[PDB]
Amino acid sequence: PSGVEGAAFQSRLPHDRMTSQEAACFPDIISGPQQTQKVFLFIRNRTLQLWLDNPKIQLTFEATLQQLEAPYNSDTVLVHRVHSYLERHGLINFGIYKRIKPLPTKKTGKVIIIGSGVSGLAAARQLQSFGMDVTLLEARDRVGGRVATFRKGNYVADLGAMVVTGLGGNPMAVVSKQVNMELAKIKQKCPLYEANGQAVPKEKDEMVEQEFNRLLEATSYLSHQLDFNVLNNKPVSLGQALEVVIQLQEKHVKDEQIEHWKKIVKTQEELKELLNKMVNLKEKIKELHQQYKEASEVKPPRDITAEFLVKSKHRDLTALCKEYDELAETQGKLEEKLQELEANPPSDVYLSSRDRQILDWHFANLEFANATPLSTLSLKHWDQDDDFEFTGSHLTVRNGYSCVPVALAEGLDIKLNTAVRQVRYTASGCEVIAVNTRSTSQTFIYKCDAVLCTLPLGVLKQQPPAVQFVPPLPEWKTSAVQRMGFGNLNKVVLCFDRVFWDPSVNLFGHVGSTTASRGELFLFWNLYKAPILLALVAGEAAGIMENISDDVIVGRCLAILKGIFGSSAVPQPKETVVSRWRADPWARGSYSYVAAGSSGNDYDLMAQPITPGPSIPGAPQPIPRLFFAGEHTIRNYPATVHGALLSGLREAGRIADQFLGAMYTL
Amino acid sequence: RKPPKGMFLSQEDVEAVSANATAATTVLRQLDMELVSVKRQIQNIKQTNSALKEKLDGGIEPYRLPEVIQKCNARWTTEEQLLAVQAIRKYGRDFQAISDVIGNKSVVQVKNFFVNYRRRFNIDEVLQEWEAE
């Protein structure tokens, strides 16, 4: 898209109608005449454009109004309202801009932010620019959270997020202009190599992939048009539904063979019945010939009955000889109809044991995409975010994704090596209790108006609790934490001193011997300047490989690479790193997934802030005190870095509206 | 609205594979066993029809008679009349067979012949006698 209409698209907003969010801030506009609605929408879309076309400087309200043409710049208060809504909710003036108007000398309100991952950092940075006192508590010795970059010498490799999924409507696009990210595209081409070490031939690769895509499309049919979403009082997973769909294909192949050979027997029997007339007729002909000979033997002159007998038997014999010919026409019509059907039998198998291995690799992709075995994904809901995907190529970050959190951390109060241990929220405020990760006896108490929790879903899931809430989180929240899925996905970084792979290929697959090991080192990434290959561990393999030492793992990696490239082209690696994210106590997994029995509605439950009970009974109902952000809290963009970031922007707007007031609603 | 082409997915089949834990591998096994049943029933009727074919070697070539190319005629010689009455006695009303016996009479004057000699040759009685057999 293009123009002001393109700014709305790049801000994930409809250009020609008003969202639920802005109906709430502008209930006068939306309930009023469409002429003002179109004015409003134009003011919104234009202001977004201004910010988007240059996001390295703050977009002040005045700069906005100066560049607004009439009649749109007539209502000066509407323009100030729109600009203030966009600024508050992080649609403009978010990230790392130079600020025209420097910060107010003295702050208002005090917020404690648990975690300095991207969601935390994005909120912290907004809150501070709104005039609040913000402190982040971070368990690790570095910022970024699940954005984690390895750096040694000139080796650089991401252990966490690696790709930016498109810039069409993606908030990272704005960040990539503010921070120096070396964004390099990913060429979709992915050569596969079976366990032996030899490339899967192109004819196979296209057919299995298209079956994979058809199998998926087929489960959607089971889900929607057949409503196959509960089986034995339990929710159906994607994985179950795939087995059901594969079985029914195997079944139809047998159904198809049975009726084919049943057409063979139906006509072999029709032949048998024909050959039976022909034996019996050729015996009748044999006898009747004999009788014609004997009758013919009586020599003339004959009386007329003896003459009749010759003429008679002759008529009778040619009649029977005519039947036996009509029945050898028919015998040929069928001896061909048979050899025809023998010539064209149907498919012998649905998929060979070689095919279902290559199909298993395409399932390892899907298991990688959702960081979980397909047996845990909700059949109905696992792809509920597909409608909000961004447009464009997927990219990687050549200088390491960490440049982004590190950049956002500039100018913020971050206490590292500070493990939050307990969160107390009351009608009058909050106190957060943390310890030092190096010596746990050293204890800290932080007092604040509000806590913004960005603890990973895996941490919130931990029993017994790594973090205690006082009072406990309500059942509606903890149940959402149970129902949701927090998956797992690991990486092996292989640092060589020579590039020996095809450098025109960003990524290539390895097909697994077994179904159960389909995720074990199934995919390799060539993303970086230096000679670094990156190897994925997905599905059920991920959780298993964490209990295997690094040397065994890098070993299995070397064997696979030698199989493809030859035992002589693959040197020992200089440096090796193996992630274990489920083992990491500040992650306990990689990212969330729509578990069977869950839905995207749970992502909304996770984002709902907590309001404590009154300290004095009969006192008026209080303000909300505990807020939640993070990738597990944003329904339309879960499990991504852009999704985390957006959730931080969201809570910062929500918290500011609470503690500073929203003056844009009159 | 419909399953992708070449996918087969009917509601009745899905219940049949979801009924228990192994309802998949039984339903498949029954068809696998039912197929080998049919494959060897082929081997059997194909073996039977191999024997029947052996019996027909030679066909009926030795038992064939030369075709009597013979111009028609409309004059009923006495012998031909007597052939006719006997053909009526053994063939009922099958005018093609009767014309084929006499040879030089076509199917129509055979038809005509029954009315022409109906009384003189008791052609009624001859058919009544033929009816009894």
Place of tokens 């107390």: A424
Phi, psi at residue A455, to the nearest 5°? -55, 135
A4-88: in CATH 2.20.25.10: no
Look up residue A80 and give its amino acid.
H
Instruction: Please answer yes or no on whether A275 and B102 come within 8 Å at the CB atom.
Output: no
Q: Which two tokens stand for residue A628?
A: 């939640």
CA–CA gap between residue A473 and residue A626 (Å, rounded): 10
CA–CA gap between residue A35 and residue A594 (Å, rounded): 42
Look up residue A251 and give its amino acid.
K
CA–CA gap between residue A144 and residue A406 (Å, rounded): 7
Q: What value, to the nearest 5°, has the Cα angle with vertex B29 and ends B27 and B35?
A: 105
CA distances for A133 relative to A66, A110, A443, angstroms: 32, 5, 22
- Give span(s): CATH 3.50.50.60, chain A: 111-147+402-472+612-659
Cβ–Cβ < 8 Å for B11, A244 = no
Instruction: Kindly write down the DSSP assignment for every residue of B13-33, as one continuous string.
Output: HHHHHHSSSSHHHHHHHHHHH
Q: What value, to the nearest 5°, has the Cα angle with vertex B62 and ends B58 and B66?
A: 135
Q: What value, to the nearest 5°, has the Cα angle with vertex A257 and ends A252 and A263?
A: 125
> Is A28 an 8 Å CB contact of chain B?
no
Look up residue A408 and give its amino acid.
L
Cβ–Cβ < 8 Å for A237, A376 = yes
Longest Cα–Cα distance of chain B, Å, equals 90
Alpha carbon B74 to its chain centroid, in Å, reads 34
Instruction: Please answer yes or no on whether B17 and A265 come within 8 Å at the CB atom.
Output: no
DSSP strand pairing (A443-448 vs A592-593): unpaired
Cβ–Cβ < 8 Å for A196, A562 = no
Q: What is the DSSP letter of A635?
A: T
The structure's method of determination equals: X-ray
Cβ–Cβ < 8 Å for A75, A38 = no
- Interface with A, mutate which of B26, B63, B100 (most A CBs under 10 A): B63
Contacts with A279 from chain B: Cβ below 8 Å: 52, 55-56
The candidate with the shortest Cα–Cα distance to A187, out of A489, A498, A510, A526, is A526
> Is A91 an 8 Å CB contact of chain B?
no
Q: What is the DSSP letter of B62?
A: G
Phi-psi sector, A548: left (phi>0), alpha (psi -120 to 50), beta: beta
Helix (H) or strand (E) holding A509, with range, is strand A507-509
CA–CA gap between residue A250 and residue A142 (Å, rounded): 52
Contacts of A388 (CB under 8 A, 6+ apart): A12, A636, A637
The candidate with the shortest Cα–Cα distance to A253, out of A341, A348, A381, A164, is A348
A250-343: in CATH 1.10.287.80: yes
Look up residue B124 and give its amino acid.
D
Contacts of A555 (CB under 8 A, 6+ apart): none
The candidate with the shortest Cα–Cα distance to A323, out of A267, A287, A280, is A280
Topology of domain A111-147+402-472+612-659, per CATH?
Answer: FAD/NAD(P)-binding domain (3.50.50)
Place of tokens 């992630």: A579
**Strands, DSSP E only, in A579-646?**
592-593, 626-628
Look up residue A662 and give its amino acid.
A
CA–CA gap between residue B124 and residue B114 (Å, rounded): 9
CA distances for A547 relative to A541, A550, A559, angstroms: 11, 9, 20
Taking only Cα atoms into account, the Rg of chain B, rounded to an integer number of angstroms, comes to 32
CA–CA gap between residue A211 and residue B53 (Å, rounded): 47
Place of tokens 């006898």: A287
Cβ–Cβ < 8 Å for A518, A482 = no
CA distances for A558 relative to A489, A533, B20, angstroms: 20, 11, 43
CA–CA gap between residue A647 and residue A454 (Å, rounded): 9
Cβ–Cβ < 8 Å for A114, A455 = yes
CA–CA gap between residue A418 and residue A138 (Å, rounded): 5
Last residue before each gap in chain B (C to N over 2.5 A): none
Contacts of A271 (CB under 8 A, 6+ apart): A331, A334, A335, A338, B49
- Give span(s): CATH 1.10.287.80, chain A: 250-343
CA–CA gap between residue A646 and residue A576 (Å, rounded): 33
Q: Which two tokens stand for residue A60?
A: 């002040």
Contacts with B30 from chain A: Cβ below 8 Å: none
- Interface with B, mutate which of A253, A260, A308 (most B CBs under 10 A): A308
**Strands, DSSP E only, in A149-257?**
149-152, 155-158, 163-164, 183-185
The candidate with the shortest Cα–Cα distance to B23, out of A247, A648, A171, is A247
CA–CA gap between residue B3 and residue A221 (Å, rounded): 6
How close A390 gets to chain B, by Cα (Å)? Answer: 26
Q: Which two tokens stand for residue A497?
A: 């001193």
Look up residue A420 and give its amino acid.
V
Q: What value, to the nearest 5°, has the Cα angle with vertex A222 and ends A216 and A225?
A: 120
Q: Resolution reached, in Å?
A: 2.8
